[PDB]
Amino acid sequence: AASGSALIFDEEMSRYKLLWTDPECEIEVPERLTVSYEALRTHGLAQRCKAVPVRQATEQEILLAHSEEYLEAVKQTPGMNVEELMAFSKKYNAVYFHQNIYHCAKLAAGATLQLVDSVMKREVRNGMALVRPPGHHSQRSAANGFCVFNNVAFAALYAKKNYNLNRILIVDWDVHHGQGIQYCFEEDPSVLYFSWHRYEHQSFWPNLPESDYSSVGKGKGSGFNINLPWNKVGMTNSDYLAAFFHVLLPVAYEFDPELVIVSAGFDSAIGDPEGEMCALPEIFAHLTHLLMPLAAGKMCVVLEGGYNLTSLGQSVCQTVHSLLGDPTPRISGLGTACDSALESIQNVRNVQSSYWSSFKHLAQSETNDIVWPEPLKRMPASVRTVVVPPPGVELTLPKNCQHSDISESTAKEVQRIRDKHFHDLTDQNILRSLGNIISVLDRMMRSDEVCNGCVVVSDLSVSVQCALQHALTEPAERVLVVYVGDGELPVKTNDGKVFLVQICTKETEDKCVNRLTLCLREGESLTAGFMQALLGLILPVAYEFNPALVLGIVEETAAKTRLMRVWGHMTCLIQGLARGRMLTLLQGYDKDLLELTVSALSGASISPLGPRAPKPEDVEMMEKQRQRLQERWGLLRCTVSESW
Ligand SMILES: O=C(CCCCCCC(=O)Nc1ccccc1)NO
Ligand SMILES: [K+]
Ligand SMILES: [K+]
Ligand code: NA
Ligand SMILES: [Zn+2]
Numbered sequence: 001a002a003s004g005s006a007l008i009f010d011e012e013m014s015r016y017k018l019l020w021t022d023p024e025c026e027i028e029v030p031e032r033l034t035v036s037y038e039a040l041r042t043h044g045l046a047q048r049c050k051a052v053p054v055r056q057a058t059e060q061e062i063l064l065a066h067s068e069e070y071l072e073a074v075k076q077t078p079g080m081n082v083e084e085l086m087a088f089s090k091k092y093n094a095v096y097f098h099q100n101i102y103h104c105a106k107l108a109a110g111a112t113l114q115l116v117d118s119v120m121k122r123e124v125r126n127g128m129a130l131v132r133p134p135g136h137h138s139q140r141s142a143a144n145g146f147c148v149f150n151n152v153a154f155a156a157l158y159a160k161k162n163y164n165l166n167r168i169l170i171v172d173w174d175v176h177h178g179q180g181i182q183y184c185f186e187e188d189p190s191v192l193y194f195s196w197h198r199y200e201h202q203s204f205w206p207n208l209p210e211s212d213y214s215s216v217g218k219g220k221g222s223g224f225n226i227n228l229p230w231n232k233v234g235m236t237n238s239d240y241l242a243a244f245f246h247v248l249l250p251v252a253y254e255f256d257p258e259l260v261i262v263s264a265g266f267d268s269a270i271g272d273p274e275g276e277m278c279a280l281p282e283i284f285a286h287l288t289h290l291l292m293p294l295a296a297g298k299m300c301v302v303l304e305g306g307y308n309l310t311s312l313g314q315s316v317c318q319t320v321h322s323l324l325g326d327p328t329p330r331i332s333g334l335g336t337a338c339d340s341a342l343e344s345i346q347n348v349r350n351v352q353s354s355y356w357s358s359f360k361h362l363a364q365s366e367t368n369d370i371v372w373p374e375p376l377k378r379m380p381a382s383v384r385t386v387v388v389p390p391p392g393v394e395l396t397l398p399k400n401c402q403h404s405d406i407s408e409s410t411a412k413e414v415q416r417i418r419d420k421h422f423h424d425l426t427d428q429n430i431l432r433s434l435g436n437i438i439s440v441l442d443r444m445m446r447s448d449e450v451c452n453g454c455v456v457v458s459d460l461s462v463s464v465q466c467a468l469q470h471a472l473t474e475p476a477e478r479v480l481v482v483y484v485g486d487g488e489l490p491v492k493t494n495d496g497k498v499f500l501v502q503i504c505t506k507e508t509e510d511k512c513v514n515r516l517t518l519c520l521r522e523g524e525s526l527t528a529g530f531m532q533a534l535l536g537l538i539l540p541v542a543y544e545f546n547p548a549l550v551l552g553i554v555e556e557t558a559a560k561t562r563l564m565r566v567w568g569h570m571t572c573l574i575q576g577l578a579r580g581r582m583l584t585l586l587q588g589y590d591k592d593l594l595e596l597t598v599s600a601l602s603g604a605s606i607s608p609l610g611p612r613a614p615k616p617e618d619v620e621m622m623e624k625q626r627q628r629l630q631e632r633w634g635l636l637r638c639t640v641s642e643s644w
Helices: 031-042 068-074 082-089 101-120 151-163 179-185 237-255 283-291 309-323 339-354 357-363 408-421 430-445 460-472 526-545 567-574 591-601 616-629
Strands: 005-008 126-129 168-172 191-198 225-230 259-264 299-303 383-388 401-403 450-457 479-484 498-504 515-519 549-554 582-587
Touching: 005 101, 005 309, 031 309, 101 126, 101 151, 101 259, 101 299, 126 309, 151 168, 151 179, 151 259, 151 299, 168 179, 168 237, 179 191, 179 225, 191 237, 225 237, 225 339, 237 283, 237 339, 237 357, 237 526, 259 283, 283 299, 283 309, 299 309, 339 357, 357 526, 357 616, 383 430, 383 591, 408 430, 430 450, 430 460, 430 549, 430 582, 450 460, 450 591, 460 479, 460 549, 460 582, 479 526, 479 567, 498 526, 515 526, 515 616, 526 567, 526 616, 549 567, 567 582, 567 591, 582 591
Parallel strands: 005 126, 126 299, 168 191, 168 259, 191 225, 259 299, 383 401, 383 450, 450 582, 479 498, 479 549, 498 515, 549 582
Antiparallel strands: none
16 A cells, blocks of 8 residues: 655756746746745655656657647747747747746656656655646647646546546646636546636636636536636635535545546635735645545645745645645634635536536425744654554554553542542443543643544443543543434533534434534435535534544444444544544444544545435435534535525
8 A cells, every 4th residue: 555745846847937027927936946845845844755756748748638739839949039939928828938948848747747657656645746837727739827738637638548547636726727627628527627716707817708617517528627716805714615515525525536636726825916815824734635535545736826935835835744644733713605705606516516416406496915824833643543452452553553551640540530420330441441541632632642542442421421521621622522323422512612423323303503413314325425414514513613632432333334434534534623633432342443443543545435326315404404503603604695
């Protein structure tokens, strides 16, 4: 199984620049590459990636996406003087040429192909190519928007041809629309293109009607092009995450790509003079993290734009941190997307409802100078995951996992807690597990040596009570509890410090807004239903709640239901919260569930779900939960609110 993250970079790509006055092009500078690599070096991140050399894309590889006429014309630019390069540049929109840009364009494209090969050959899990010139605007026969050749279109075409892939996801989170990519794949159902972009009702460059939400693809490709236009500037973390939870992720997990390619322009970040958005560099840690469970982790991140040298370096670092598996930063202050964003989101969801299961209930009425704080450090835990199996059970752990050793003080605390709240308890196995829970929690909370943990337990109520209560003291300001099982737990949600997600079998009305109860009907559609709940309900609320610790709980009766085909996906996605600090209590020994839990907790790749559609009874149940909760938890909203 693949390990490591590739970093593809070469300083030759900084050796072309603009040679005449052009206020429109002067932002695209060599230093974008320099500053990004050096930020990766400053933070120790480049040193932890597998350096993979660049190469030239061959003529045959260029012709996968471009015409002979356009290649032949670009092939002449190395012989041109400055006057001739100016004349040639003026034939295109917002692009400049330089004696060395053809060379660099072949390197940017070859670097991307190097990244695809490394990932697809399983030499690395994932990676990032830091390239110039960018590519997502270039077209079959035109340079455009600082782009000469379409680096990301190459990668998907090349991955199709040489690895016989049937499903490729391209995510373009650059602030501009990648119209070159859209045109390349508009008729192709094998490539799903998603782009958000500043649009402002078509007044923002490149000013194209087909960058609107109504362009869904053409022909056999209808439904595999998704445009989310931003019609105001100032979009925040909340807007970007609303886009992911309510548009991109439901479609991406249903598509089930075999490879993910990211057109990663960071001009969508705060401070950028082109984007004028307000999302913090830390959001890219989460945009990367939320997509990493797809395609068994096979993700190729390719640099596009980004022009504020400061937010550029920080956003590159946040992305590579997540590719390397470092713990995600906590995102505070999340809430409803703004009204303009909710309008764009509801519009794209409505036009896409003809094509995607997650949105299908919408189709009929029966169914429905700028400055910001420096990012904190993101250091991997010495031991990522600690595991406490039943006594005697030895298991093969991934290289970054360990078994627990109850201390003397810990043992005194269990006696104290025993001598207050469970006085008639002497079952020295339970008392061992309570020492295990406290020992694990103290390593998670106090030390940065250990990130998360999993403890197998016998008695739920005493273990849950001591886990939760021990977390609340020694401050964990807020605790998210995720319980798979029936019955009521010793968990009080009447103070705002605990949010409880319960996935159960009995349909029970819940009364207050700090509890989300999901009764999913039994059957084969249960896997699709849980995934829809996870992306569209659980993750929006959890992200807004912003817990300091996550407590997972699985009762023994549920440990062999179809609902635990998704346990790995939830465990990976839920580590976007609380900087990955999650304690899981498994009731009873299940060898596989404990293996899967530890695997996901440790950051391993997880198997795809493959293939369908969920029961309409479940969709109605979930939308009733959204109605009940979205006034309190605005990140749940995916429509504009009713004005009174
Ligand atoms: O980042 C990019 C390319 C940016 C496209 C060029 C912007 C168009 C423009 O008109 N820019 C401008 C002109 C004058 C003054 C300031 C900006 N794609 O992802
Ligand atoms: K974009
Ligand atoms: K397509
Ligand atoms: Na021009
Ligand atoms: Zn851009």
